[model samples]
Target: HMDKEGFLNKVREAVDVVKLHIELGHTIRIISHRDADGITSAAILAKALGREGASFHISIVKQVSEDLLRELKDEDYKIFIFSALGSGSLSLIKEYLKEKTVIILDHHPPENVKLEEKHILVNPVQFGANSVRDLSGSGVTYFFARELNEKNRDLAYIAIVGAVGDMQENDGVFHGMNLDIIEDGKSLGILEVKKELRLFGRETRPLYQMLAYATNPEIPEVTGDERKAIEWLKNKGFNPEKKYWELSEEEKKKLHDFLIIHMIKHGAGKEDIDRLIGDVVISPLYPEGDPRHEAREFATLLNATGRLNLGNLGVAVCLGDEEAFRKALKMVEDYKREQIEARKWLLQNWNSEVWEGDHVYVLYVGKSIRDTLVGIAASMAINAGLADPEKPVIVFADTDEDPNLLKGSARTTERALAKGYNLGEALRKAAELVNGEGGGHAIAAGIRIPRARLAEFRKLIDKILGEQVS
Candidate 1:
């Protein structure tokens, strides 16, 4: 009976414990990852705590490592609420916070470690739920906040943004626990969902630019060439300067059908073409012409805050700070410009820097890309067809903060996952063999290794991936 209802009841149970601590005036330490989901998770929980008149301190991190916990152990906080983190490091949490109470609101795969009496782990994966597609880190926190107080139900839209931030939408719609959240948002009238072109800049970018920037299932010549997209749209008698939503009803349908045909003609499968259109989550917090009106765009903006190490700004924006939102807009633009430069670098250097193998593609970016950008570059390479989508791409770059270490990111498509590839396990094993650290998800993972062990790590990953498929 570990269904959605059962899973929610478990969340309510944790909320009860949290409520007691709040009522007793315990100082809670909130630690979360520096990603969109984590940022939203912290904001949701922070808002809930504020409403309950609870005192708390919040901090963001890249990971919940032993060193981090060791440093935090000296703090005077009595309760630690870990959002979007702590599931993977439960053993470490137990070791360091044995005397303190901890509540983990997360969706990542948990470690095989027993928890102490003071630790409360609330994760959908523990309840036999689809962690990848059903719930995000923020989704769990949102549910916890909802159970904590019904007034927090208005935070449902933020959970949807977090879900989109994690890329939990499969083939255009969310499933399982996410569906319940979507229902909450819809009932509150702050969110709207519709089937539309799943391309970026749906509300802000012009028609031609939207088409040209389409990387997920890139439309061959049209994706990289703005002129070609303009020509295509003008030839069909549609205004290429207008946004997709600005187009008429007939114009929208025509443009949509044409893109499907073009993608199919240019070697896109039914699956990839179908992904061109899906459920688009819209929020009323921003106006139509604003970039943050769409969930995906807002998620991207929040993601930029985390990558730029301004995670607190993202949390503030989620909590409706106008100054934070204004500052975060600039951060989003900076992130996009950097990503464009990274793509240009990839196009110019992939022929020399990438090594194609049967099981995986290895890319060495050296110092050309920031360590925080390795995963983004790897995913872009796979989605834009610069790297073979059928194989996982393992990318490496010089760690900006640590000169002696290399940051690694591994990304794979659904096709590779269907072929029995688990990039998370593969990278974790390879990194461990190289005396490093790595783990994330089946299709997307990361690693940090000594620069000297790069060769050994590459070979280990190749062997591991080969074994995985066999």
Candidate 2:
């Protein structure tokens, strides 16, 4: 845990850097991750800068890669700002350093980064702060904002939202620095923490429908068909309610049993069942499962936007723009359709032979599917029992036009983190060995490697795992 004084010192350092950049009249260009954390961080900076009469261009990217570096170099932004992803992206940014000022506000572990004295790299790990596990990127950005103007303190609410969305406070109780953030939110009246669960979106009917469609039985050999599954659900006396809180203990147990059995029957091993059981039941909106319609709706909207490249519109909706909200709703419909199509494509082209690996399973996607669909692919692989749920699933997508590069996304269990297995660090080291660049959070990380170096990178990663296990 970071002591109060230590937290305040980090805040001071971050603020001083932002103030210096502002005083120097540099235009800030923020590049954040497209997920909830990135969006919230950008919102913090945007809100703070808005109060200061300074404007910055904010864009979200799936992952930072060499091609992304080339694009950034081409754009003549005065200051290159990154939130949450700064540490993972250092190697790529270092190579393209050509006098453009960079400010990295992040909490991920830093590997071998070459930094100039003038560069601002504010990371919690470096400061012996617990921000990596406790604070989201938005939290770091909020600190920077609070330093600039105490009036921008309202941004803490957004930080809480980012933290929740990233699942930082999902252990059924808050401890350490997380408790402090929660207390701050309560004091400021910006947050209301409660316990509840439901399907991923607002419309109860739609959520239920989606849940029914997505549910797979643990023992498919015994359950047989949808009718049998529904019968099993009925026999358990489990009633789908508007909220998870509405369910009785017996009902909750029934649901859990059904889901667990379905996973096991479908090939999910003991580790997978354990992870699913421990998961927070929040509908996609609030990390803590807020019953607000807007929260659930926003989850669907944001996810749709990311999948469809209408992320800016999603941000606009988040800012309370009516027009953008309408546009996002339409995009959600299209996104649903695309998801169905992508599912069909994966099912038709699914190859079990390609999943072979020693420590983990690899799903190599073709160029036909969009790069953004990698997560969908990995999820399908898991459901099909082609991969280990305990191990990290690496989805390699050759879906983009950049033939020289392949985009890799990894999803791992929290237990893996406890075992000192960090995908971000692992990917960072692997990318470096292959003369590429990549980094991300411990559980979920992304990397962009030159296609030519794919074999070499995979070999190095396997070797790393071998050493770890040994």
Candidate 3:
């Protein structure tokens, strides 16, 4: 197991290595995932390095491709620090590592690609640490920051925010090594845990529409009487004015009961209810009372900025600078409008076939939707009930490259997690078979390959699932 002392020691070693590279006058290039964890990690590292007079470059990437590798070749940085898992890109970069030094601070399971001896890789699993099944990439980055400089306590709060963005705090309780980090944040007054239901700004919107557009809840099954739940919430004075903390414990419990019962009665399974329950308990009421609302809003804004290649603005807002926040907010609004238009186009033009197996819900999208919104389209499919609730859903985005590139996004419920299936590992193996690359968390992951090999990749995924479940 990863004891507290052991975790701290690992950080110390990583810091020492960073110091050595810095002393050698090596320029640092940091490439992180495009989500909240990646954004936060980039922000923290940027801030720390800024204080040290070190030069650095930051980029947000999905999965690395040959195009990305070609771009990296243009930079002559001496050292590289990657957040999240970049094993796919790592494989491409491995051959060119004779003159480059690399450090990976990540939580996702690594891909099967080989690495050079010059790289320093740190992952919880490698150190035999298990606390929460989901660990944000920023959390790993935070440890390295602390090791580099004890005065970097401010960065820990950002790490906590990243963890919450990743839904690592799903169970209301922070178990495992995450608990230690939470406690540290609590001691510093940077972390607060309260029981509340998370509501969105579009509280009055139709539930179906809300679900269709929600960034989270890949599959939302309305289990209870929607009108009744709405009435109950209204009757309890749970409106847009008052916040979550303003409600009494009894009122909070009532809202929780209403939502839980509604979800269960409608069709949500035990695992779905459990995960939603955690979200409700940890989320505060809408408007002023809910911090999670801000978290989601922030994450969504960050995602929009990253996807549009405006990652610097997103990082600036996370750093709490007012000017940057305004710019980021404007970008998010613009991106949301673009996403809405894109969604309409997808709904009208896309064709998909539902292939249900004994353990999964698989939807294969046409090239139209595949090229437009490969990552976000999967969320749209789940919200529309085009897939199964209990089974993990994989959406394949097709490309036109010579090898035919396909991007994938996988989502699963807690039941799937209990079934000995992990999307990260599944994608890693599938990507390897197709001579592509992929890796992420158990519930969500991304993959890339040649378009010509799309059928082969699908067959390989089917085989992987068969072995895991059968």
Candidate 4:
């Protein structure tokens, strides 16, 4: 609250500057991430721009690369607005966007967004706001949309969904500006709050199976032990046929208490357990049984669409287009099927000379995993209990956007991040050492490197990780 003034002032300046550009008749283009937040960010701006009759082009990517820089250089767009991404690629933007007016509305830590005459950067962390816990990429874009017009307040529902997509609710509720966004949604009667089970797939997965799949702090007798979880559920008077979201208040409380006692005895952290029964957001825009009605599942749909080279479908879905939604939904089912194959690929090739390391595990699957899917797989590694939760995982794969180069992804848990292991910093520095570029948050990040230098990149990353955790 003490930092509110400076933050809001930045917003005012950003709004004023953007309005001037619009008045000057500058054509805008959007370069954004392909994930859920990125899709929503682009959609928020798209809605605002369309209302103003502004001309804007939109492009989505898993990461910006040299190839993209080359393509951008050939374009003649006047104002290139970057959202959700482009903060860490400040060097690339500086090198290529000098001739264009660039406006970046991102929440990630950025060393440069050029607050100079030609460029404008609107990031919450720069004005005394917390980047990690408070806001998502789309949340920042929502502010810019609101600045465009008061009528943009209706877009708050989309912003809240984006926040939930990013898992903004750590204490079982949104924080800071995120809380403000959802509060607006509540005022408009577009969002509903419920205290139900916090598990993903609750509306879809069987009650007992959902518990058996819980991974945050793997239940000692449940996770990977479906038989035991089944017996425990029956003994506790729970029906396997009942989906988690279908349980009555009395049944829900009984289940929650039983799990709490079980997790406590197994030494699951207090904060983790507290969030297990935290806020469950409901959206009125989608039907009750639909995934979009539940926030995280909707996010997963967007995530799958982005990772599966169907990013356009995701942006369209976020913008509320019917055909795009149907196409992306089918793409998501296909992506999930492919993901099952990826998990099996990992199990078979766990250490078959695929560059698995000690302090940090490195996986190189040439053309087998797209750069888009690499980070997702790295994330799945820790979640599936296949890798040490405290150790960082590094994955390398060929890029779809640029076949000539390779992409790298690094991931670690918040628990490991607390131990002073910064994957973003390590990966960025290591990438630089191998004549590549990368930077993102401490927990998850990515990089682009020459395919031939990947071995050296992995070696340097292991050395860097050793130094950080030593």
Write model 2 residue lDDT over 356-428, tens digit each, in one string.
Answer: 4565556666565568767656655555554565667777877465777788777666565666677777777
**Candidate 2: how large is its RMSD?**
4.8
Strongest candidate by lDDT: 1
What is the alpha-carbon RMSD of candidate 4 to the true structure? 3.0
Task: Write the residue-wise lDDT of candidate 1 on 68-136 in tens digits.
Answer: 999889988888999988777788899999998889999877776899988999999888876678899
For all predicted structures, in order, the TM-scores are 0.95, 0.78, 0.81, 0.88
**C-alpha local distance difference test of each model:** 0.85, 0.62, 0.63, 0.76
Model 3 has an lDDT value of 0.63
Off by over 4 Å in 4: 112-115, 170-172, 204-209, 216-235, 264-271, 339-359, 367-370, 401-404
Q: What is candidate 3's lDDT per residue for 281-387, written digit by digit as tens?
A: 22222244223234545566677677667777778867777787666766655655565654555456434455556555555565645342655666555544555
Highest TM-score scorer:
1
Per-residue CA lDDT of model 4 for 332-355, tens digit only, reads: 566655655666677577668356
Comparing 1 and 3 on lDDT, the stronger one: 1
Candidate order (lDDT) = 1, 4, 3, 2
Backbone clashes in candidate 4 total 0
Candidate 2 has its poorest 10 consecutive residues by lDDT at: 215-224
**Ranking of predictions according to TM-score:** 1, 4, 3, 2
Cα lDDT for residue 303, candidate 4: 82
C-alpha root-mean-square deviation, each candidate = 1.9, 4.8, 4.6, 3.0
lDDT of model 4 at residue 285? 73
Pitting candidate 2 against candidate 3, the one with the higher lDDT is 3
In order of listing, the candidates' clash counts read 0, 6, 12, 0
